[PDB]
Design a binder for this molecule. Structure first.
Ligand SMILES: [Zn+2]
Ligand SMILES: [Zn+2]
Lengths: 565, 566, 231
């Protein structure tokens, strides 16, 4: 009466077992809510997404499941199996009725349906995950760092008993081919089984291993605490649902990892080891109003409270933190060019250029700080690791954020891919026959030292700075030198306000550009717009006026004043 | 398959080979070597059109169907041998393999990606590029055993799913039911049979140049057996038919398990429409050039000649063959000697993103190791890595900062622009590699013969050399790629009056002889071809007329008036 | 037999079981063949129409895709045929050398690499080498101990022609070629193994000048990226 019983439970079917009660409970729940889901998509993908708020709705549809929360948290592998068998029974009953109606005017083979529950609460942070969570169902939310490749994984294996002819679906622990020790029927214990690898009970699915790092407060919770990470295993439809850098919410069971990695030294090898079996994954991709109502100078001076002077440098840093408009026409595939401006700090030692890059990475919600001596090509570009996987580098880790590069005059070919990232918002990969293009929508702020030390002489910027024109033409702002509340304000502005350029702001830029032409790169004008739009996002305004443009022009005037000397 | 299915399959195939497929078996019988594996290529579509159940039984049990096909091939070969007046003139061949080709075109059988676990056990085709090949090999595949009570000699097979490993049986498969479990092995005692099948492991990868393949392509192992070995090399475009199987090794005391999805090969093959027809009718030409040029790169002010020259670059070209058998190129070459920041880089990058099968670089950012060839090594093993000039084979290669390269990166580009090939000679890897590509370059400079940092042989290597309120509002109003991609795709598959226009213009540049005049080799002539095509290509024509050649003179003269003289 | 001889070997075909490798990726082969040698023999009209403008015909037919360079193709034909290996076997009088060497000093874009390719293609035993990915074992004999001596480009080109492109980019991996052009031999001294291997080859090479286009007042020993030890 239960077709597919062996697809979820390895036990022998018995109407006296306590499984029937929960199975019929979830079957009632699914029959009452059969119109809420797409049966075709459930059959094709082999899974079903159920809202946890629907199970805890309370009433009549959930009458036979009053303790769904406790049973799911403490016994997930049993509750999910019962739920999957119930939805499979509902689908096969509906399809058998349809097939009978078709025959009147009956072998329906419904495959395995993964019962996936999303939007689970309470949310459990990774730092509070200990060993006692083993066998429990919890939900986490974090940023993806590593995404491995898709690989086949044999979950179950079919075994035919030579005594009674019964075929069982024995699950494998970590994929280890083990032989059953007794026949599942309580009659004969033949203890001799033949493997049936072509049988439908032998379950083989796609498998992926992702790594999740906790959402760490870059200043509050950074008082000696390291960001904790954990491994998650996606299977079947959950495979290829997130890329490195996305913030995803993953609900699943906590299970023991047994490989074991390493080694060595000295020493990150751990025999003792944890991981998460992912059941569902969701990928997204007042004090503020007092601040909006001298806002520019207040945020500017509050970026680095330990750096004296550099008022224009802090002014460009705030503009880069908010950023312009990522004007990507998704309906026209019109590239957004770039809305993230770049900053160059040309200064002598002892000015605090490194401290400005630190504050750039600290106040930003996604900051990556890099020194310019211990440099590797894989430290900034994507890293290829084959047995292949692509590991995000500093130019990829800084996506939707700011990356700071100190002493880049000391970097060699490990730095030239940053030029391709500042312009294409992407990283080029070509190694070991693997060719790809990875995202890198980041804002690059950098600082360097002059050629002959103190350069208050008759030379200009392109001559005194240890840098060629291939990178000088890529910066929106060049400055020549010789916390949590503003963090929330910047994060809210990057998510809420999308700026535009008005006509009054353009007329000011037209007059300055025409007067600059009469004195006789194009990216200079692109900087005027990208910083003006950044000023509109700073003021939480959807449209930048002439006042914002004049301020951006004066900032660019200071950049062009230190230059062209 | 039950008896009815096998019977119908055998009868249908026997009738088909008794009616047709006679000369192939005759040529197989006419060969001298009798111990050789001979293939019989058969179209699967025409075979499945003759009977309904054969296709079902092939898609349900491919291995046994192929075995029955081989048996019927042996029977038909014997029948054709017995039908000859002199049967002793030929020799019977027992190693006959039916190789399936030409499956019904459908997404469930013709694949462009690597098959997943759902496709295990199914027969299908996968199209990819060969990234790795192994040597040709020999070893055993069947093992003979004998019974201790009846002296019956039987044979056991090697499990392909366990990397061809043998397991000792415990039952006598003789015609009389023997209860004997003691058997003796006869594989290593003598060499009476020569039972050994060829084996080779190749590695294919998805083609990122295809529209269905995403950013990261996946790889797959293909196992070739018998005559299927030595049929391909590293870099070939293959369409491999075969069965998706799983090879595994289990856990041990200190060894971890490993499961792998492989493709056991059976045959190897070496490689809106109404709107486009309406756009072609309106083009059949000057108004069409203005539309293509504006739609090629709308993010730029003016530069009508650069938009037109790029159009010919994406347009050309078609190879030819002269009386000496020399391959005569088709792909174009455009040089953009523009001041930095004028937007020439915005062209090439959007043009490389708008075009399928396209590559690009930024000069010194990719030296000769990233432009041509690189002998990737590991132990006493090596392979060939493709560069920018190679990956663009039958495509486009764009190079900004073109004069920022070293004289050896230019020498490698000199060969790719002059031979469609790149010589390989690194480590123990020596070969000749085909790089049939077009090169769209742009130079950062310091008349137009001193500001360029390129040698005079290299400037002559380009077909066209171009020098580079209403601007603010143009961006403000800005503040498609897909159709133009599909244009140049269909369009890339498409006289005396022409040759006159181009010889007269060249003679006018050759007569007034001061100190500057080079000798044409092919870059002129075949630019004239791909330009002449382009003006007809872009507008969908099969003949080059006067309007095509006249517009060429206008562009070529403007290129020699303001640009570097050829 | 020594590495480089053309031998005729008769024997049985037997299965090889070691098995080699590994790895990657991937020349390892469990499946493997070999030959059990039973015997080994070591050796060491249209022509008449061609003999009867023969020089210029062979010269122009060496590289049919290189324009000009009539004198360069003239020296290439002379190096292909070669002089007399005047070795008095009854007197042990050394033949000195009968294989001439060719140097091509030219700017980029002239087709110097193509001349070296045609040099190695028309020759019955041609070895072409680039001057960037260079190893000392790539040209000299290679020592491999568990010892064996593996023939390099200077040894593989024995009784033939070896082409070296962009040798101005080669360092100490190129200086043994000077000893091969003069001694017709390669010196080996590594891991206590001292030997002298044959290298009767003809070396044709091409390089780039120092400061690019050199149509100036300097000579060859000054414009060419090469010292007098090889000129
Ligand atoms: Zn049993
Ligand atoms: Zn027996």
């Amino acid at each position: 009466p239960y077709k597919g019983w062996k697809l979820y439970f390895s036990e022998v079917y018995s109407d006296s077992s306590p499984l029937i009660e929960k199975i019929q409970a979830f079957e009632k729940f699914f029959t009452r809510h059969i119109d809420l889901y797409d049966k075709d998509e459930i059959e094709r993908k082999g899974s079903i997404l159920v809202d946890f708020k629907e199970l805890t709705e309370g009433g009549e549809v959930t009458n036979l499941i009053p303790d769904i929360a406790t049973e799911l948290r403490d016994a997930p592998e049993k509750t999910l199996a019962c739920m999957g068998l119930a939805i499979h029974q509902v689908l096969t009953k509906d399809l058998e009725r349809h097939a009978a109606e078709l025959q009147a005017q009956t072998m329906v083979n419904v495959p395995h349906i993964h019962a996936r529950v999303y939007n689970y609460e309470p949310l459990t942070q990774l730092k509070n995950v200990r060993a006692n969570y083993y066998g429990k169902y919890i939900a986490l939310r974090g940023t993806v760092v590593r995404v491995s490749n898709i690989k086949p994984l044999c979950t179950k294996m079919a075994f035919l008993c030579a005594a009674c002819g019964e075929i069982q679906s024995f699950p494998l622990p970590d994929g280890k081919y083990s032989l059953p020790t007794k026949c599942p029927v309580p009659v004969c214990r033949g203890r001799s089984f033949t493997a049936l690898r072509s049988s439908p009970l032998t379950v083989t699915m796609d498998w992926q291993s992702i790594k999740i790092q906790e959402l760490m407060s870059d200043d509050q919770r950074e008082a000696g605490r390291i960001p904790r990470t954990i491994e998650c295993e996606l299977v079947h439809d959950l495979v290829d649902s997130c890329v490195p850098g996305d913030t995803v919410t993953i609900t699943g069971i906590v299970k023991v990892s047994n490989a074991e990695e390493g080694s060595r030294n000295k020493n990150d090898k751990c025999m003792f080891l944890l991981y998460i079996e992912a059941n569902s994954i969701s990928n997204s991709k007042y004090a503020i109003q007092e601040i909006q109502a001298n806002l520019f100078k207040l945020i500017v001076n509050s970026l680095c409270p330990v750096i004296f002077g550099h008022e224009l440098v802090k002014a460009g840093l705030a503009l880069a933190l908010f950023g312009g408009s990522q004007k990507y026409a998704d309906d026209k595939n019109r590239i957004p060019i770039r809305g993230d401006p770049h900053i160059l700090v040309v200064g002598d030692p002892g000015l605090g250029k490194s401290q400005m890059l630190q504050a750039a990475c600290n106040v930003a919600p996604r900051g990556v700080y890099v020194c310019g001596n211990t440099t590797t090509t894989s430290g900034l570009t994507v890293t290829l690791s084959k047995d292949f996987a692509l590991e995000a580098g500093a130019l990829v880790l800084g996506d939707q954020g700011i990356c700071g590069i100190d002493e880049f005059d000391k970097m060699g070919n490990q730095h030239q891919a940053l030029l391709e990232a500042m312009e294409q918002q992407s990283i080029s990969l070509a190694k070991a026959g693997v060719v790809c293009s990875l995202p890198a929508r980041t804002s690059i702020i950098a600082a360097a030292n002059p050629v002959g030390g103190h350069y208050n002489k008759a030379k200009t910027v392109s001559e005194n700075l240890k840098m060629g024109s291939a990178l000088l033409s890529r910066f929106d702002l060049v400055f020549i030198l010789l916390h949590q509340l503003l963090r929330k304000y910047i994060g809210y502005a990057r998510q809420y306000v999308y700026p535009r350029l008005s006509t009054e702001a353009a007329r000011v830029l037209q007059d300055f550009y025409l007067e600059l032409r009469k004195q006789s790169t194009t990216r200079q004008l692109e900087s005027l717009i990208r910083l003006t739009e950044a000023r509109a996002r700073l003021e939480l305004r959807e449209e930048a006026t002439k006042e914002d443009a004049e301020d951006i022009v004066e900032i660019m005037k200071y950049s062009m004043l230190g230059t062209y000397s | 398959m039950n008896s009815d299915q096998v019977t119908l399959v055998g009868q249908v195939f026997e009738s088909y080979v008794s009616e047709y497929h006679k000369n192939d078996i005759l040529l197989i019988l006419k060969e001298r070597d009798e111990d050789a594996h001979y293939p019989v290529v058969v179209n699967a579509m025409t075979l499945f059109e003759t009977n309904m159940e054969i296709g079902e039984y092939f898609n349900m049990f491919p291995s046994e169907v192929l075995t029955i096909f081989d048996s019927a091939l042996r029977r038909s070969a014997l029948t054709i041998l017995q039908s000859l007046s002199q049967p002793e003139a030929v020799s019977m061949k027992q190693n006959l393999h039916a190789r399936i080709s030409g499956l019904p075109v459908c997404p469930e059988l013709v694949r462009e990606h690597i098959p997943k676990t759902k496709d295990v056990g199914h027969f299908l085709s996968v199209t990819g590029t060969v990234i790795r090949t192994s040597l040709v090999k020999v070893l055993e595949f069947e093992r003979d055993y004998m019974c201790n009570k009846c002296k019956h000699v039987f044979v056991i097979k090697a499990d392909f799913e366990q990397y061809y490993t043998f397991c000792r049986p415990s039952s006598c498969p003789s015609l009389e039911s023997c209860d004997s479990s003691k058997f003796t092995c006869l594989s290593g005692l003598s060499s009476s049979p020569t039972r050994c099948r060829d084996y080779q492991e190749i590695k294919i990868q998805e083609q990122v140049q295809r529209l269905s393949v995403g950013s990261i392509p996946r790889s797959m192992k293909v196992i070739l057996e018998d005559d299927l070995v030595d049929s391909c090399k590293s870099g070939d475009d293959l369409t491999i038919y075969g069965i998706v199987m799983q090879r595994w090794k289990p856990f041990q005391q200190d060894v971890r398990c490993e499961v792998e999805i492989v493709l056991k090969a059976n045959y190897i093959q070496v490689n809106v429409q109404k709107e486009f027809e309406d756009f072609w009718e309106y083009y059949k030409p000057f108004a069409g050039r203005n539309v293509i040029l504006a739609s090629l790169c709308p993010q730029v002010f003016g530069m009508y000649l650069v938009k037109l020259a790029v159009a010919m670059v994406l347009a050309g070209g078609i190879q030819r063959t002269d009386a000496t058998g020399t391959r005569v190129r088709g792909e174009s070459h455009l040089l953009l000697v523009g001041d930095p920041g004028t937007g020439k880089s915005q062209f090439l990058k959007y043009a490389a993103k708008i075009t399928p099968r396209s590559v690009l670089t930024t000069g010194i950012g990719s030296t000769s190791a990233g432009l041509t060839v690189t002998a990737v090594k590991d132990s006493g093993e090596w392979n060939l890595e493709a560069g920018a000039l190679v990956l663009a084979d039958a495509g486009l290669c764009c190079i900004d900062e073109f004069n920022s390269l070293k004289e050896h990166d230019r020498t490698s580009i000199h060969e790719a622009m002059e031979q469609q090939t790149i010589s390989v000679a690194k480590a123990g890897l020596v070969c000749k590699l085909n790089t049939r590509t077009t090169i769209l370059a742009a130079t950062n400079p310091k008349s137009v013969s001193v500001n360029i940092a390129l040698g005079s042989p290299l400037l002559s290597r380009f077909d066209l050399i171009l020098v580079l309120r209403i601007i603010s509002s143009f961006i403000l109003e800005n503040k498609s790629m897909e159709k133009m991609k599909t244009y140049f795709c269909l369009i890339r598959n498409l006289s005396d009056v022409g040759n006159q226009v181009l010889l007269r213009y060249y003679q006018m540049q050759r007569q007034s002889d001061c100190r500057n005049a080079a000798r044409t080799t092919i870059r002129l002539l075949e630019s004239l071809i791909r330009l002449a095509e382009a003006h007809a290509r872009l507008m969908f024509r099969d003949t080059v007329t006067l309007e095509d050649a006249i517009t060429v003179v206008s562009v070529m003269e403007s290129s020699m008036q303001g640009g570097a003289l050829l």
